[PDB]
């Protein structure tokens, strides 16, 4: 389930060090480059005022883009803790310099279990992204396509009544997921698998 989540992100630009956590007990930071030279870089990070440490940088191709990443161990991926991050060239010029609270960089799985059913308005219902805790804190957003109306939902909801719909039109639905709380932020998940439904006579 990894590659996609990264590929999703890297469209967030090369000026920011892309970083996310999967179960708040991990951290992965990556950045893509070009393949013409590879380059020598030093990933240094500090947690609080503990001594700075170094992170082993690994290389990989994507096709012909090359991606450098580095994983952070579970003990020093506590939440609510300012964790600094520093990618530096062997020349010494800093390439990124970030401050992430690890609680703030979550990337959730796609929600599963989406169904729809109707005379009146339509009831969508679905399941929170599987094998992710804190299911009572998820944010979801749906997308009524036919042409693109997005209905926004908030903490802990797994259904919706699609008021103000149409008739004699094919409709497609989907729901994404993200953590949303005062101490919970991150990027939107990938869209759930879509469910289709044809409206009644009008």
């Amino acid at each position, epitope marked *: 389930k990894f590659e996609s989540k990264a590929a999703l992100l890297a469209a967030r630009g090369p000026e920011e060090l892309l970083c996310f956590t999967e179960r708040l007990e991990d951290l992965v930071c990556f950045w893509e480059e070009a393949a013409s030279a590879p380059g020598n870089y*030093s990933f*240094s990070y*500090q947690l*609080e*005022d503990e*001594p*700075w*440490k*170094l992170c082993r940088l690994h290389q990989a191709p994507t096709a012909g883009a090359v991606r450098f990443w580095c994983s952070l161990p579970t003990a020093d991926t506590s939440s609510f803790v*300012p964790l*600094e991050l520093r990618v*530096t060239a062997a020349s*010494g*010029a*800093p390439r990124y*310099h*970030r*401050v992430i*609270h690890i609680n703030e960089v979550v990337l959730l799985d796609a929600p599963v279990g989406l169904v729809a059913r109707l005379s009146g308005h339509v009831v969508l219902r679905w399941l929170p992204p599987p094998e992710t805790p804190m299911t009572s804190h998820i944010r979801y957003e749906v997308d009524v396509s036919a042409s693109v109306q997005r209905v926004e939902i908030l903490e802990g909801r797994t259904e919706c009544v699609l008021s103000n719909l149409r008739g004699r039109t094919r409709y497609t639905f989907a729901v994404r997921a993200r953590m949303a709380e005062p101490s919970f932020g991150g990027f939107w998940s990938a869209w759930s698998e879509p469910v289709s439904l044809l409206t009644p006579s009008d």
Partner: antibody, heavy 117, light 107 residues
Framework: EVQLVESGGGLVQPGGSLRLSCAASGFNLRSYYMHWVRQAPGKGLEWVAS????????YYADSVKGRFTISADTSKNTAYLQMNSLRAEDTAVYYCARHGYGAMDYWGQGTLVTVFN | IQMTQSPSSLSASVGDRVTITCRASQSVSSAVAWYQQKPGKAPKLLIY???SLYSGVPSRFSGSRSGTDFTLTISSLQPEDFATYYC?????????FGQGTKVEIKR
């Protein structure tokens, strides 16, 4: 346990030289960012230089480049700021700090550089 | 990267709520810190990561971010709070401080 102690400040004629020392007790210096910051008398704070852990990468402020050089002796657990071509404007109290929490958490008491004619 | 504090000084009474603002120019990360300096003493850290209270700093001190405006707020001034205050920003290689804010007593 952490304590930063500085030395080497004093009076200096313009163009002369001083080497400041900053002795760090309570942590290893090779594993921390160290900063020199100076405070002109009755003026604000002005960052001067930095050195990075494990690679001793020096970074300076344009108002200090070339004339100052920041350095560290890992064995002595001490960071040094050499100031050459001193100017009347460099008269200030110079502090050494330690990077922590995204900022400078532990500060020395500071040492006074006076540039007199 | 230019950090501009306002006001440069203000006078308030004990128990007053006082808000200091710090204006960043270039795309500024949230690596902003707040410092206290009393006459002759070294700077003392109060806030880091723009909102987190340094261990031992009283609850009166708070930090917030509103885009390019970073604020330090003291909820209710106590006599040991009247000092000079600095905001600090670290960007990639450069570290800048605000021009400094002097908090004085209204009497």
């Amino acid at each position: 346990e952490v304590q930063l102690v500085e030395s080497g400040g004093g009076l200096v004629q313009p163009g002369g030289s001083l080497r400041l020392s900053c002795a760090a007790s309570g942590f290893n210096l090779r594993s921390y960012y160290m900063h020199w910051v100076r405070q002109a008398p009755g003026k604000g704070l002005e960052w001067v230089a930095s050195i990075s852990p494990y690679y001793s990468y020096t970074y300076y402020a344009d108002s200090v480049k070339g004339r100052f050089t920041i350095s560290a002796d890992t064995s002595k657990n001490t960071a040094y700021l050499q100031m050459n071509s001193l100017r009347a404007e460099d008269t200030a109290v110079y502090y050494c700090a330690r990077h922590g929490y995204g900022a400078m958490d532990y500060w020395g008491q500071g040492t006074l550089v006076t540039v007199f004619n | 990267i230019q950090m501009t504090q306002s006001p440069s000084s203000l006078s308030a009474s004990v128990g007053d709520r006082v808000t200091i603002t710090c204006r960043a120019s270039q795309s500024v990360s949230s690596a902003v810190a707040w410092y206290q300096q009393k006459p002759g003493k070294a700077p003392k850290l109060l806030i880091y990561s723009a909102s987190s209270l340094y261990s031992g700093v009283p609850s009166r001190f708070s930090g917030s971010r509103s885009g390019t405006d970073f604020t330090l707020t003291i909820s209710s001034l106590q006599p040991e709070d009247f000092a000079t205050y600095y905001c600090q920003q670290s960007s990639y290689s450069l570290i800048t401080f605000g021009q400094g804010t002097k908090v004085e007593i209204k009497r």
